[PDB]
Design a protein around this ligand. Structure first.
Ligand SMILES: Nc1ncnc2c1ncn2[C@@H]1O[C@H](COP(=O)(O)OP(=O)(O)O)[C@@H](O)[C@H]1O
Ligand SMILES: Nc1ncnc2c1ncn2[C@@H]1O[C@H](COP(=O)(O)OP(=O)(O)O)[C@@H](O)[C@H]1O
Ligand SMILES: [Mg+2]
Ligand SMILES: [Mg+2]
Lengths: 614, 614
DNA sequence: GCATGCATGCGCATGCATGCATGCATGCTGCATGCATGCATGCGCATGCATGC
DNA sequence: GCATGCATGCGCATGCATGCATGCAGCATGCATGCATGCATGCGCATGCATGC
């Protein structure tokens, strides 16, 4: 029967939902969607814990401290408003600043039980999504009547109830036999996941701590193993810890699950674009020095190397791939290789690409070997089946892979990369498993000269020492050297000393600067690094240029000319060069946001290739 | 959760209540009463089982056969209509013809369990009305909050439920002590009664059969021990008949309780007066021979005895009694005595008064003795207290007592009747009991002459032989004799032979006429016996005449004249004669329906007294 | 007016429906034993590759 | 070209999380007796009345 306290807690949350009206229209929107569009959306909204502090302090403190008394009231209050604006229950989500309830699996203790918490870590394993039976319907052929029953369990209501163990009906109240109507019963899905502390926040050489999260219905398939995640929910004690006859059974009943992005991880980074942002992105295009402004802002601290600055942007945007009715796939990724002297900032260039790209994985020479790049087979304890867990290149699909110290790899891995750089498929034929996986990735790499330093007397085949088959699979092979000089020594020295003296905004000189780990959230003046990602993200999703009848003649001339010319080149010439020219041409048209490839872009591609060749 | 069958059964009873709209306005009336009048009325109505047969046959058959499935639906349907017309639950009652479900406690067997039945019999014992606790409210001084709980049992719902044995709360959910708020809790009353087969329908010399009826709330104090009753309800089996370890526990859960009237019983007879009836009753008055027409219709089959015919009507209407501020009570009942020869139809006159009067008890000489007339003391097994059960004259309050063979009584009962005929109180002083009871009754009696036949040679003191104290307590002493003759022999013979040849309407001559037991229900041409009761009932309730300054002189003259006159009279003269004249005068004014006594009535009273005296 | 037998209350004795604790034994049930089963582990050996000479 | 040493997969024993039945015992519930209690029975005895003579 009605409780006064429940009623007042509902009333105050009705007033809260009335004062800040940004949540009512959000509820309106989902009904508008599910009616006008008949992908049915789930019945949920998100609340800010910062708004609650301003509106009411005690109600805020109560959800932080006593969720099991203030959450069902708020949910019922929300359901009432939903049924009000209406011409299936509803549930809430939580965001804002939590404070002392922003914990990790190691610092989460028994004094935080029965409160709402935020937990950080890595997802290590997910289970199979299973149906759960709620209501079952039956039929009696001797009376022409249908009967039903309801089932419930302890992980669906935040407060403790008196158990009702009902049974599965096979028989009528007179004895008539009942047929089970599987299509008329209701089933709701279930999944369980385990979380662990992230490897770069955990103490070195110490065993890790983990926590179990239970998800149901709509939150059931949001993540995969090996992800950075933030979860919010109630830390619940269950059952009796052996007092009917280790301790109590503890787990989190999830309500919010946020994917997070980190360096060298399989979760991509995306940002929400404001119309103001779009206006600047589109304004920048018309000025006909877009390429130079964007190129010089690519790690401006390294000096020169402007053509590699161009090439990295061309790889970051990339062309277009094409599928024919036949069933043929034609590649559209660009790959870069760099050979130079042992103090030419190769690793700074690689690390910058790792920091800026939306999805990137870092590998160093012999570091990754064999299965570590392609895939490996494991066994599942429960079902007993043999499964696959992804290697580096399977994870970096529609992305970039950074290979530092490229020349240190064995031939066995080289033959495996031959298949990824051209067909972009990985084929596995192990005991019982025969499957093909997708790996559509671009590759950037850096290599050391065989003789320590580049020898101008000898020809390239004696300095590089890589097979022609692998060389042809790289679109661009750049060579760089540091010529000892005085003019450039002065110029470089002065600039490098400029850089080494820089105050971050807001410190008195002397004060040490402070380091923090950057965890993201997923959904001629130089341009800011945070804006370059916004530019690229729009430039890939929106523009898909088509080929014109003009520039084909330029490409044809350049390819024919190169193949019937007799200068010693830094790479062999094949049909791969023919396709490379088109990929390069379409990348520049992605830079310009035009719907068609053009002649100026074709000549920029040709100029770049010829500089990198001769 | 909702049942389809329950829903359809509710819907059809909504249609039934809609087609016959005589039950909706009855519900309207009770709300009108309880709002306008703020004696709150109970929430109940009465349905006809004859209407149900015409509207739907299967629904009728279902209530007769399956009450436990069609009664809760009908009650809910009624509650919905009540809450509809509204600008606490409601319940039903049943009347009409039942058929094979009109049984007695002897013919009620185990094949009628779980069906609605009608039972006839006599109420033999009633229990004490006790409160029953439903909802209890509490207070916590450490939190300023009030808590409640609900209780239920098996005798409140017609269908079987799963028991919930809740406990009495003394403690809060934290441990705070609670005060019990007796004024805020809800209590509903309870009573149990036993029924037995009536003595004039039961087989002679055989032990009787009985049945238990449970009544609750509003039906809790409708009857008293020693009443003819008709009860309708469900015949229920309760508990487990020893199968957890005689047979099952059987009882009736009452819904309807009707009092019935029978000859020589304490339940009065009343009829509902139609406006058409009132018009005839009031029309008859204006004609100035009302007394003669009503008098000659009093058992017309007995011949002559017209002055006794008048006297019986005067007793049947009676005067008015008066209470003073002082605390004095002045009598208003009339009493009659008759002395005559052994073939003068005395007992026919007595039996006619027994059959016609609204409440009458028959006693014959030595038949009733001692406690049988006044009262007796018994003991109650449960509470152990000494109680009183009423004798004949305590039961016949505001009524008549017929004593045939008056001269056969002993002096001990005569002294007890001295107190009833004058002060109309009975005083009991037994061990522990000292109480005074009300007995306001009129008395008619008949006595035998001492010498077999009335001897004209001797004076009345030698023929009657009753004490002057008792004679003065009788208003009228009539004497009658049969004078052997020829003219009156012919006249009486012919009339008596007329009577002995009479065909009831609708029989071929020869066919025996059929006897039936007449059980009533409670709430110059000759006038019908059924109408005389209607006349008397209105004449007593409505008219209460007052005394005028005119007729007092007539009464004064007659009383003075009689007390200073020297003829041998048939009774002594006292102030009892003075009061008798006023009682007689006011009775005739009750016959005329005038608001004041008059002179013509006074002279009729004087004439009647002087005929009965001389 | 006197003598008599009946019916009315006293004054014994006994049985009888209610009601509740105690010692013995019933009847179930939670606990300790034994065991089948299938997945993972910790291991030594044979092959194919990379690094000199 | 040739000789050598390391990483990878094959082959072999062993331990160990799940899971379920059975004999034995510990353990609480229902039953049989035993009695206390207060009411009602029914049974002879004394008194006050109604009848006969
Ligand atoms: N052209 C350059 N401009 C600025 N700094 C440079 C340049 N070349 C090298 N450096 C600096 O010198 C160091 C080069 O180290 P590293 O990145 O290991 O070189 P490499 O990868 O070529 O062996 C870094 O401090 C880098 O910042
Ligand atoms: N005056 C009368 N008129 C009609 N019938 C009479 C009359 N007197 C007597 N009777 C009849 O004679 C019989 C009298 O019997 P009963 O009532 O016992 O007489 P009583 O009571 O006077 O001794 C009945 O059949 C009655 O109907
Ligand atoms: Mg380096
Ligand atoms: Mg008689």
């Amino acid at each position: 029967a009605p409780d006064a306290v429940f009623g007042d807690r509902v009333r105050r949350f009705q007033e809260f939902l009335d004062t800040f009206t940004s949540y009512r229209d959000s509820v309106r929107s989902i009904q508008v969607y599910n009616s006008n569009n008949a992908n049915i959306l789930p019945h949920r909204i998100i609340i800010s814990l910062d708004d609650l502090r301003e509106f009411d302090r005690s109600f805020w403190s109560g959800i932080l401290v006593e969720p099991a008394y203030f959450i069902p009231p708020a949910e019922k209050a929300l359901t009432d408003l939903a049924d009000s604006m209406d011409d299936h229950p509803w549930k809430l989500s939580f965001k804002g600043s939590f404070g002392a309830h922003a914990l990790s699996p190691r610092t989460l203790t028994a004094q935080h039980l029965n409160k709402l918490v935020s937990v950080e870590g890595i997802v290590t394993k997910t289970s199979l999504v299973r149906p759960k039976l709620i209501r079952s319907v039956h039929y009696a052929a001797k009376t022409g009547r249908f009967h039903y029953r309801d089932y419930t369990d302890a992980t669906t209501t935040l407060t403790t109830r008196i158990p009702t163990p009902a049974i599965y009906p096979t028989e009528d109240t007179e004895g008539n036999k009942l047929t089970t109507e599987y299509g008329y019963s209701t089933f709701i899905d279930h999944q369980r996941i385990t979380v662990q502390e992230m490897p770069e926040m955990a103490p070195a050489g110490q065993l890790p701590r983990s926590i179990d999260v239970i998800l149901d219905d709509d939150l059931v398939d949001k993540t995969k193993p090996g992800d950075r995640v933030n979860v919010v929910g109630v830390f619940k004690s269950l059952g009796a810890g052996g007092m009917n006859q280790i301790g109590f059974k503890t787990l989190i009943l999830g309500n919010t699950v946020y994917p997070l992005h980190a360096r060298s991880t399989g979760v991509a980074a995306r940002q929400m674009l404001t119309d103001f942002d779009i206006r600047n992105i589109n304004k920048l295009s018309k000025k006909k020095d877009i390429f130079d402004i964007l190129s010089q802002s690519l790690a401006p601290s390294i000096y020169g190397h402007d053509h590699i600055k161009k090439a990295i942007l061309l790889m970051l945007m990339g062309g277009v791939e094409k599928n024919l009715e036949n069933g043929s796939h034609l590649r559209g990724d660009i790959n870069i290789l760099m050979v130079g002297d042992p103090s030419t900032a190769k690793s700074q260039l690689l690390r910058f690409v790792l920091n800026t790209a939306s999805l990137a994985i870092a590998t160093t020479g012999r570091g990754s070997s064999g299965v570590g790049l392609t895939a490996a087979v494991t066994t599942d304890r429960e079902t007993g089946e043999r499964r696959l867990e992804a290697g580096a290149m399977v994870l970096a699909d529609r992305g970039v892979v950074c290979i530092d110290e490229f020349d240190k790899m064995t031939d066995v891995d080289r033959v495996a990369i031959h298949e990824v750089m051209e067909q972009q498929t990985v084929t596995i034929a192990k005991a019982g498993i025969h499957t093909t996986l997708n790996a559509r990735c671009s590759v950037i790499a850096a290599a050391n000269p065989v003789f320590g330093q580049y020898d101008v007397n000898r020809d390239p085949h004696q300095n590089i020492a890589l097979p022609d088959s692998l060389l042809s699979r790289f679109d661009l092979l750049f060579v760089v050297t540091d010529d000892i000089n005085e003019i450039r020594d002065r110029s470089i020295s002065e600039h490098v000393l400029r850089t080494h003296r820089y105050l971050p905004p807001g410190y008195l000189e002397g004060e040490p600067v402070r380091e923090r780990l950057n965890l993201s959230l997923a959904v001629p003046k130089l341009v800011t690094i945070p804006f370059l990602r916004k530019y690229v993200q729009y430039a890939k999703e929106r523009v898909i240029p088509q080929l014109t009848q003009e520039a084909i003649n330029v490409i044809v001339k350049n390819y024919t000319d190169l193949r019937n010319d007799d200068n010693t080149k830094k790479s062999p010439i094949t049909a791969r060069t023919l396709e490379t020219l088109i990929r390069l041409a379409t990348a520049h048209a992605k830079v310009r946001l035009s719907k068609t490839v053009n002649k100026v872009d074709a000549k920029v591609a040709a100029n770049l290739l010829r500089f990198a060749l001769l």
